[PDB]
Amino acid sequence: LIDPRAIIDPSARLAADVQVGPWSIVGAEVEIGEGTVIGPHVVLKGPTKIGKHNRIYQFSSVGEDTPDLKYKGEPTRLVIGDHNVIREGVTIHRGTVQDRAETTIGDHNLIMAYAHIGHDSVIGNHCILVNNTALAGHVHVDDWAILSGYTLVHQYCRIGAHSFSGMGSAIGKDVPAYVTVFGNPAEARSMNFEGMRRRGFSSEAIHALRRAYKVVYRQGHTVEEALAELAESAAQFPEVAVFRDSIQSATRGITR
Amino acid sequence: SLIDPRAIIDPSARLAADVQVGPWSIVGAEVEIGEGTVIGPHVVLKGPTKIGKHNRIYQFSSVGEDTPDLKYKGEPTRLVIGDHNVIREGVTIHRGTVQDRAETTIGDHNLIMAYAHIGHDSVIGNHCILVNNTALAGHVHVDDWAILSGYTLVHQYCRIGAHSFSGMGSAIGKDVPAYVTVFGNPAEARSMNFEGMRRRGFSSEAIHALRRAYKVVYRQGHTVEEALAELAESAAQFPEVAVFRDSIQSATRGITR
Amino acid sequence: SLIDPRAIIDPSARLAADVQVGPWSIVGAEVEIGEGTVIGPHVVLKGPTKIGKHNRIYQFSSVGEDTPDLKYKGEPTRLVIGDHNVIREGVTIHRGTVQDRAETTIGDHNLIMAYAHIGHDSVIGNHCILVNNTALAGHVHVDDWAILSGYTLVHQYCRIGAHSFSGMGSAIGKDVPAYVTVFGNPAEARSMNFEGMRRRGFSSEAIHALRRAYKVVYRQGHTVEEALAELAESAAQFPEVAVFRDSIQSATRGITR
Ligand SMILES: CC(C)(C)OC(=O)N[C@@H](Cc1c[nH]c2ccccc12)C(=O)Nc1nnn[nH]1
Ligand SMILES: CC(C)(C)OC(=O)N[C@H](Cc1c[nH]c2ccccc12)C(=O)Nc1nnn[nH]1
Ligand SMILES: CC(C)(C)OC(=O)N[C@H](Cc1c[nH]c2ccccc12)C(=O)Nc1nnn[nH]1
């Protein structure tokens, strides 16, 4: 199971069932949960927790220090939940003390080749980061979001649930939930209707969201004006509450 | 010896005469490597995969992996690489899918530069150049002598025409006709790869006919059907113009404008 | 032992006494590493290459490979890296070509982040930051304190001026004068790196002269020659404005407007 050409540190803690391929390093204070397959040529540094039925592909560096000059050797964490797929050459950095000292990844995420998850970034669940997506630092990606290949996300930006970025997008402002964004700089186009139909959203929920988009984007309203209009549609439909909450929590403005 | 003893060579792998495998490389089950092919160190080959003769594959490359685009994979899907190809550091090439071609296909004399991605069921021809971090989604066809500048992104099902050129950071969402130069995200047609025509020894008459051929398609408000009819005569006279017309004829999903 | 036994040290390699090399790293023929330098695991160092003192080179990096550039034909060319440089994961640095100066040169105190590329015959000075996946094509000069944000692409022969800044995903096809801030694909001149100047402690008087110097080049309908002639006075008075004027004077591909 543990290939004899792998270096497993004494401090490491590997649940039974765990596979580690040859020439992989499981470093000091790295936990791995049952069912997790670590590939060949993987560098795991801690303090790091990895959950269950994860797959980490060759040439990935999971749990290294941020090179960001605002990090001076403090003991910070990286947590990864269950049923994640981390592909070839992904880099995931641990937190910094300045924020919450944790980089966090939930469950059922698909992180494609050469993606970068910067320090203190929070990834939720069932997210897809397509090839070479780069999250700068303190980036929050809520559940089911999809970032197309070579999507760049500025420090501290929030990526809403069910949001979609087009290929080569450069995001400098929050993307509300359900919103599709394209280009450099990134601009709002539409709602992720396919994402809603994926979730078996009621036809009434999809209509409430279709309208909610117009309130925010295509009706000349300010953000405070728009939050007021959405407050009843949000009280009625939980799906709209997600959209409304993503705009409310966007203190640094929304992607328009 | 040619096979470094720190490399893992599966019993089912077939190595031909003059093959080199550098240290800590994996030659997985049902990988076939042809005559004089050099596998660097830290290379992962996964099968079923057929690599031809006098190829060079650099460190940190993953050649023959499964697409992550499916969660439950198919077997057997194949990867076929021809002769005299250069695959540089950190390149990812995915095998085909059971739904579509069941094969990713690369021809001969191609240069695939560092960290380029070739997605499931894509077809590369001959004498192509994929510059650093070019990424092909899935079922992309790159025809002979196409050059994609670094960080070019190509959407699923798109055709890259022969002798075409993409500018750095191009995001191609529709077919690029033969010879056409495209730039930006989203990609826009600018001109033709006259530089590339001269290097292939194209007659100046064939180049003048291709310049007029660009105007017919792009600059004179014609339907594609009208463009094809208007090009028919030039196309009969010059094989070079026929390559252009044929690339436009085969675009079901529209051309890059 | 500071040399991991699983590492490959070519007999012809010249390592200072306290050099570290992690497991499964290759220090090839005619590679020299100065005192304090830590090489991580899974690094390929190829020569002829000189690395100075107190450098750090992370896993999956390929430092000193031949350029795939077709004009190179296996000639004996060099890479030279100075002291106190950080080279992050999967960085690729190519040696030079005989057509230029047969050398790729990196100075001191540079931070080169994950999957950056430094093409043949590139010259990087001191205190530069190349953020993730920055790609320099070839013969690119990046002068002191320049910051290039992630996925910045730089065309062959482009000069990146001192204390210059490029935004996320910039595509630089023309020279970036010193202090100038550029964004987007293609790169556009926005203003000057005042944030960067103020922080490094530039004089109020100097910043004010650079602001007017910016106006002169960009905002007064002057051609480059008329701009340089107008700059003559302030260039004469202020060094910072001389660096600016000089970076314009040495621009071979034009300047980013
Ligand atoms: C550049 C590259 C890497 C070759 O392709 C992509 O970036 N992504 C595709 C879509 C895609 C791939 N896997 C997925 C899984 C779930 C949902 C969508 C996808 C795409 O083409 N995105 C897009 N379309 N228009 N603009 N950007
Ligand atoms: C692609 C990726 C990694 C997700 O994002 C970045 O490139 N981040 C940079 C951060 C940065 C700014 N200055 C620095 C100095 C040293 C080190 C890092 C920086 C940025 O966000 N660049 C920018 N700013 N405005 N537009 N693009
Ligand atoms: C992103 C990176 C790696 C830093 O540079 C490039 O993409 N380089 C290409 C090189 C090139 C130009 N002409 C060629 C012919 C044959 C073969 C390679 C080329 C380019 O620069 N492409 C372009 N030019 N203008 N916009 N994009």
XYZ file of C-alpha atoms in Angstrom, chain A residues 3 5 22-23 40-41 57-59 85 87-88 108 110 112-114 131-132 149-150 167-169 183-184 198, chain B residues 6 8 24-26 42 44 60-62 65-69 90 92 94 115 117 133 135 151 153 155 171 185:
54
model
C 5.375 2.054 -1.686
C 10.459 4.181 -2.316
C 6.882 5.763 -5.161
C 9.073 8.901 -4.671
C 3.799 8.979 -7.344
C 5.982 12.154 -7.167
C -1.973 13.091 -8.698
C 1.788 13.166 -9.516
C 3.924 16.398 -9.274
C -9.611 14.812 -6.988
C -4.743 16.430 -10.594
C -1.154 16.780 -11.992
C -16.287 16.324 -3.914
C -12.319 18.473 -8.835
C -7.562 20.067 -12.448
C -3.859 20.082 -13.477
C -1.547 23.025 -12.424
C -6.612 23.572 -15.626
C -4.310 26.362 -14.344
C -9.169 27.009 -17.482
C -6.672 29.815 -16.624
C -11.695 30.475 -19.827
C -8.907 33.005 -19.070
C -11.210 35.167 -16.861
C -12.861 38.084 -19.986
C -9.988 40.121 -18.477
C -28.274 20.253 -12.621
C 15.259 3.472 -10.878
C 9.403 1.282 -13.179
C 12.109 7.548 -11.561
C 9.991 7.326 -14.773
C 6.874 5.066 -14.967
C 10.297 11.900 -13.675
C 4.661 9.179 -16.082
C 7.305 15.931 -15.135
C 5.134 15.012 -18.195
C 1.955 12.876 -17.693
C -3.703 9.892 -18.187
C -7.539 9.718 -18.032
C -9.568 12.944 -18.451
C -10.903 14.257 -15.112
C -14.024 15.512 -17.138
C 5.300 19.111 -17.467
C -0.261 16.563 -19.900
C -5.066 12.583 -21.938
C 3.079 22.634 -19.542
C -2.333 20.296 -22.279
C 0.852 26.268 -21.612
C -4.494 24.039 -23.536
C -1.302 30.155 -23.150
C -6.978 28.112 -24.919
C -12.668 25.162 -26.618
C -9.042 31.987 -26.274
C -9.928 36.520 -25.616
